[PDB]
Symmetry: C3
């Protein structure tokens, strides 16, 4: 009725606060941050193929503006478009600009195929001061500016190209909009001009609009660009009585389009990463990030929270006595253990089986806590220079809805896991204490502070027998029962 064995668990000076279903803050021994808030100051060029547009945005790249030669034959997973790209050529607009941009970026390559168009008596290769290469008048190198012959003739053009190949073709073509009627007749003789571009299933007809626009690089006239896709087995007809800016061929479309585009000033560095934000690449294993909604590749999911702490250890209770409202700051060899006092003194030893059992249930979630890929490439635009209305509203609302739902999932998840982690480790403590209860049987009594008063001689070999589960209660039974009741 003198030796005492105690059951306890580790503790630390002070640990980390986390969130559960119940409490707002519960202190625990160890915790891990789940939200990435650090980004590299650069974009990583591997394992994804990044292509830098430099002074050239993707549209001018497709058109073949001065400055964009370095993009011929390029292939990308991610086109890096620079916010300070500048127009260097003839002033132009693109009805449905964003859509052409999406198609080009998504396709993932600038593989251009020349074709000779046997245009009639019209002069070809028109050039301009608004589009100089060095100081020489030039034009978009994928386009061919047709004007009237020296004989003041511009006859009806009528050319056909059949796609009997195994890939869809992208034709880019334009319509010139002169500033005055004299300009119209000087260039194209006919007034009005006109363009019809047709496949078997679709047709685009364009009437030039004559009139003065603001001066840009010396020009008040404009080109509007359009595009036509021609599937294998389809064909394209170009029809014009003037103002056509002819294609010089076509781009090849990949059957499967898996590329995308990222607009950022962030430089391309030397690192390795599969995750790219417009702030730079991510290098992390965390399941969430608060850096940018604009994330391309294999990325953590974007959430609003700055921090989410996942408990990786038990509740931390600080400060001859086992668990009850006590933790052993001395126990540094395990999560649970034994603390005794017999004739030969005291001693603190860790319990392995219960420590391991706790660990495999808390770091059982290890593995499942970033399960899933989230490998996304082409997505949608998520920032805008100016309001445009209905379509943009919808894009903003979609992304906002997404972020709120994932932010919520992240909040609930951590709370649920922490609740479970707390419950598992409290349960493993009780299980240990109960296991000991069942070995001692009637040779001991529950002190009430996580300790057993052992009612018999128990030397260190006997103490050990308890810890490694070999203690036979019958050996000490009648010795013990006597000390208990008489």
């Amino acid at each position: 009725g003198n030796p005492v064995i105690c059951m306890g668990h580790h503790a630390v000076a002070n640990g980390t606060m986390v969130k559960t279903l119940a409490d707002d803050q519960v202190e625990v021994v160890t915790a891990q941050e789940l939200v990435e808030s650090q980004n590299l100051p650069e974009l990583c060029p591997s394992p994804l193929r990044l292509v830098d547009g430099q002074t050239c945005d993707i549209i001018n790249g497709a058109l073949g503006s001065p400055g964009c030669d370095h993009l011929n034959g390029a292939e990308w997973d991610v086109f890096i478009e620079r916010p300070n790209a500048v127009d260097t050529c003839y002033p132009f607009d693109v009805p449905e600009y964003q859509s052409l941009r999406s198609i080009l970026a998504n396709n993932g390559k600038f593989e251009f195929i020349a074709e000779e168009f046997q245009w009639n008596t019209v002069k070809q290769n028109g050039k301009s001061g608004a589009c100089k290469r060095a100081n020489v008048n030039d034009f978009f190198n994928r386009l061919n500016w047709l004007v009237k012959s020296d004989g003041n003739a511009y006859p009806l053009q009528n050319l056909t190209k059949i796609n009997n190949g195994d890939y869809a073709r992208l034709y880019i073509w334009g319509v010139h909009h002169p500033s005055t009627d004299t300009e119209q007749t000087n260039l194209y003789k006919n007034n009005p001009g006109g363009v019809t571009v047709s496949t078997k299933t679709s047709q685009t007809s364009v009437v030039p609009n004559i009139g003065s626009r603001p001066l840009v690089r010396g020009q008040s006239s404009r080109v509007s660009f359009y595009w036509t896709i021609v599937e294998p087995g389809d064909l394209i007809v170009f029809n014009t009585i003037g103002n056509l800016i002819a294609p010089r061929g076509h781009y090849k479309l990949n059957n499967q389009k898996k590329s995308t585009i990222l607009n950022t000033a962030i430089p391309i560095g030397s690192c390795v990463s599969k995750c790219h934000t417009d702030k730079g690449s991510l290098s992390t294993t965390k399941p969430f990030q608060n850096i940018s909604r604009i994330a391309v590749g294999d990325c953590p999911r974007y959430v609003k929270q700055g921090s989410l702490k996942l408990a990786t250890g038990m509740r931390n209770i600080p400060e001859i006595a086992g668990f009850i409202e006590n933790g052993w700051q001395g126990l540094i060899d395990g999560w649970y253990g034994f603390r005794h006092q017999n004739a030969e003194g005291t001693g603190t030893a860790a319990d392995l089986k219960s420590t391991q059992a706790a660990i495999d249930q808390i770091n059982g979630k290890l593995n499942r806590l970033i399960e899933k890929t989230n490998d996304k490439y082409h997505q949608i635009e998520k920032e805008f220079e100016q309001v445009e209305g209905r379509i943009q509203d919808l894009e903003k609302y979609v992304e906002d809805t997404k972020i709120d739902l994932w932010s919520y999932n992240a909040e609930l998840l951590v709370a649920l896991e922490n609740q479970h982690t707390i419950d598992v480790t409290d349960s493993e403590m009780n299980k240990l204490f109960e296991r000991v209860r069942r070995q001692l049987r009637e040779n001991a009594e529950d002190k009430g502070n996580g300790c057993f008063e052992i009612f018999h001689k128990c030397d260190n070999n006997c103490i050990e027998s308890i810890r490694n589960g070999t203690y036979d209660h019958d050996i000490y039974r009648d010795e013990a029962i006597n000390n208990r009741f008489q």
Copy 2:
């Protein structure tokens, strides 16, 4: 101190592995699959109304192309459009094609109301070799091809139809695009022609485009189709100086539009089902499915996982001893039970109160696991032949976002339920053991292995006295304090 009663739980040779919050794989006695991965090889024509377009797609159905007569008067919950549908009439296009198709699908019936239009001196009922019925030249039978009179007169047309009814009217009309100026004056005399269709609050004006288009079904010309919706108390005015393909009346719109369209080659069978995918119908009560994101009717929610197993039973521990690290493979008429050893031998018997308490907290959830009927009809397109740009990007991003969110929910729901199922069944085991302990009081001792050593002779009906809660402890108390402490 010789008779023993044991508390335990059933087990089987091999159980099913399932996920929890902790362990990635826990073996339970029984489990149920929640992801449907099987489909029927056909579409089921009840209880929903399916209409098979056969060689006719819904747009051609609406126009009244040859081969679409079977659609006249049709009504559907789901219109089945075939990938092998073909054009059988004059080559045409439809600006905002997708939208007219959507409206027609959603509306859910082809109920056409003929109207007499008193067109002027112009000739009516133009026909074409490109649109034969039984080797006789013809045209769309909802449309009326107006050409100039025999006296070379196409007078300005100006007719009005007033909606005095109680439903909105859908008018479909077109503009013809000739291939040459000669053609434009051969049919309509005037050049240019022109069409205006207007209501009180809207207008549409179309200028014909002239130009060569690829020969299709003998024609380089085209019709462009448009539509006008006329609400009750509004009216429609048709104005033309040429090239008008006139309506012969109007389609009736339902006020409430609840139908949709499904594009698939899958045959329509004889089976019964309320869930239709483009792979075929589903016949299932499972809450999720991995067959197709394209799913119409009363459907499981589409998820990315191939399998999610819901525990419908306790932990399965295989292999004179009760529960502690043992399950009884021989207990096959209950979940929890008694096993005993006494003077007359041994026996195993089931306990039903504990079994039923466990079943009620577990099957009580597979009923709340089959609840949200999610009945969705008209949704959005989810696969595409070719990229289009901004709008198609948004649609795909929306569907992809939805799918990832529901896949996460599915993964979490099953881990949470499984964790709860295990906790409940482990708990009912302990509650049974504690129920017996309280019955015995000081007449028995905990042997450590989920067994009580009864320190008095307890015969086979003393055993059943324990199993039924009648065991009076003071009937053996003196005969039990005895061999325990003397």
Copy 3:
């Protein structure tokens, strides 16, 4: 071997049913409703700025139609548009109506800046009988109707306005569509007319349409309105040879656009609230609502459920005996407590340490049950008069997808919280019982029904010593052991 002490928990006659992971229904003691199903019959004018359009919708207010002068200089968080607003001016359409409305509403103010446009020889300030202001022919007061000079001339107009300020400018302009070729020449001399409006990088060109339309306020002619945004550093050019409806200046755009529009007939009141639906404002602290998906401000999230009850107390079991299947209706000053019966009589007293622990895990959850701000202003349209097709489908699908994910989150959250609530309160009951067991040690025995039979003389200060944990087991042990075993 005579006095008894019991441990128990409160109850009420009538409790409320809640949902958990297991049970369809669990009766608990107290429960809180989480879904707000009540709205005020009015819109609260504080703390957000509401501007009432009254007879004027936002488009007419921007144009300056008769009756909209109250909206001059208006600024709003939410513009209240009335479904019975009437047109009071020249019949018009807006090709991209919803986008212009969205931009206007989102911007949040009507700040007009007049400018002097020195139009050439054309006459200005055209007015109309279809647009009377105070019984005199007038026009949109933000617009300038140009017509030909008395010299029967309409020369090419070519004006330029430079944006050299620090804000983006919104110009609204229109194009007039005559009914006859005679009207065209009477007003504008030239036939056809024509308008081009352009900046450095964009352009809009319109060809007027001529033709008969239904009479609306005495006119078969129409105006179509367009708009042009001009960034700081950019400029705008108006080119026209007729039919231009010119601006009298521009609206100022905010850099940060944070406002929205709400279309409803509900009156503006004098209550306070930051949540506005189209059925009226909400005054609530509940996290969900089932009133309307259309909701602006700081609102509960919209869900499909009519009710979600969150348990705020333990299980409810109604009706000498302690907890095992019995709650105490008499215990009304605490959640848990003691019930004894010694020599001097009987008695009830609530235990506070256990009541406080439970409460600190249950109310510990219900104020980051709503932690969520959900501050949402400009969103998307969510109801429509008529089907339009693709974009509308996408809008409806997005909102339906959102509502289903939030309805699921609400359902699951309440079930998880309730299960945790039940488990906490069961857990604390047991921890109470165990604590007292730890105190008694070998001086008492578990009666089997929540009660401890004390085997020694115990008066009412001996009882209180148990209930404030001062009780010493050794004092009474020899007395107690003797009665137990002899």
